[PDB]
Amino acid sequence: TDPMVTLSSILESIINDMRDLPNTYPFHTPVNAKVVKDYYKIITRPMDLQTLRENVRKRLYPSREEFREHLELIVKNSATYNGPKHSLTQISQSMLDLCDEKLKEKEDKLARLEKAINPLLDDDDQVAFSFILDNIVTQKMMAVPDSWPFHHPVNKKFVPDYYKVIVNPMDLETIRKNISKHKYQSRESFLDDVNLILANSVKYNGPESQYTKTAQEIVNVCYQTLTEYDEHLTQLEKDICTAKEAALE
Ligand SMILES: [C]SC1=NC(N2[C][C]O[C][C]2[C])=[C]C(C2([S+](=[N])(=[N])=O)[C][C]2)=N1
Predict the structure, then answer these.
(1) At what angle do helices 107-117 and 87-105 cross, to 10 degrees?
(2) What is the extent of the structural domain holding 77?
(3) Protein residue whose Cα sits closest to atom 5 of ligand 1
(4) Rounded to whole angstroms, how far apart are CA atoms 7 and 176?
(5) Do residues 109 and 209 touch, judged by C-beta distance below 8 A?
(6) Tally of CA atoms within 13 A in the half-sphere of 247 that contains its CB
(7) Ligand 1 centroid to residue 150 C-alpha, Å
(8) Which class for 106: exposed (0-12), middle (13-18), buried (19 or more C-beta within 10 A)?
(9) Which residues line ligand 1 (CB under 6 A)?
(10) Could you give the CA distance from residue 25 to residue 203 in angstroms, rounded to a whole number?
(11) What is the 110 CA–ligand 1 centroid distance (Å)?
(12) Atom 22 of ligand 1 has which residue's CA nearest to it?
């Protein structure tokens, strides 16, 4: 029994339940951008239930977190385009609320499937490594003064030309989401994403901008803290690499 198949059946059943909620039809299929002519000038990451379902069938979601992140895009896009209190946004929120109810009902079964799909989710050294990285982001990097421009993805509605300049965006919330998915097995991949924040600031704001000085401070405190914990992090990375190669069945 392939655990990815079992997981995908669970996620598909949640989509069926969400589709059945009242007034949800505007979210069943992609927005038609030839009718909503300014949609892509406002929205960067379109999402809908049909695309979500086809992604499940493409086996793109190895865990509930990747699934839920795409589902939350439906709400975020509606809040941006239609408005935070618009009925469409309330409707989209009702779908996300139902998903969270179903995920909580099945949390123990989902945990077992997710660890069967990716054993590193159960590895104590991966969990400890990710916990340290998350604390560096929240306690050190997000605490840099005036670091707010880098905390969250840029909303195209408020910075309309941002993604015409920046094609590979990165922000601290996205890094935190990656940590919670245990995307990082060593400092190298983590530092690639951290440095993308700075590189994008140099490109969009310029090398001498106050925004870039803040991004430089964020990168520097990251290096400084990784150095302080270097002995511990090195042992974690070694033990993660051993566990990752033991997952060769
Ligand atoms: C001027 S408003 C703004 N500027 C931002 N940055 C990004 C870094 O370069 C400078 C400037 C373009 C970022 C944000 C976000 S937000 N969701 N509103 O759009 C909080 C994330 N707002």
Answers:
(1) 80
(2) 7-120
(3) 149
(4) 24
(5) no
(6) 15
(7) 7
(8) middle
(9) 148-149, 152, 154-155, 158-159, 162, 201, 204-205, 211
(10) 40
(11) 36
(12) 149
User: Both tokens of residue 11?
Assistant: 């996620």
Report residue 125 as tokens: 């050294």
Q: Whose CA is nearest to atom 7 of ligand 1?
A: 149
CA of 35 to the centre of ligand 1 (A): 29
In the numeric block, the tokens 């400084």 are attached to 224
Mark out the alpha helices in 82-123 (DSSP H runs). 87-105, 107-117
- Which residue's alpha carbon is nearest to atom 12 within ligand 1? 159
Q: Which amino acid is located at 169 in the chain?
A: P
> Which residue, judged by its Cα, is nearest atom 4 of ligand 1?
149
Burial class (CB in 10 A: 0-12, 13-18, 19+), 54: exposed
The CATH number of residue 13's host domain is: 1.20.920.10
Q: Which residue has the tokens 């989902």?
A: 110
Residue closest to 246 by CA, chosen among 127, 120, 62, 129: 120
> What DSSP state is assigned to residue 100?
H
Method by which the coordinates were obtained: X-ray
| Single-letter residue type at 170 | M
How far apart are the CA of 198 and the centre of ligand 1, in A? 13
Resolution in A: 1.6
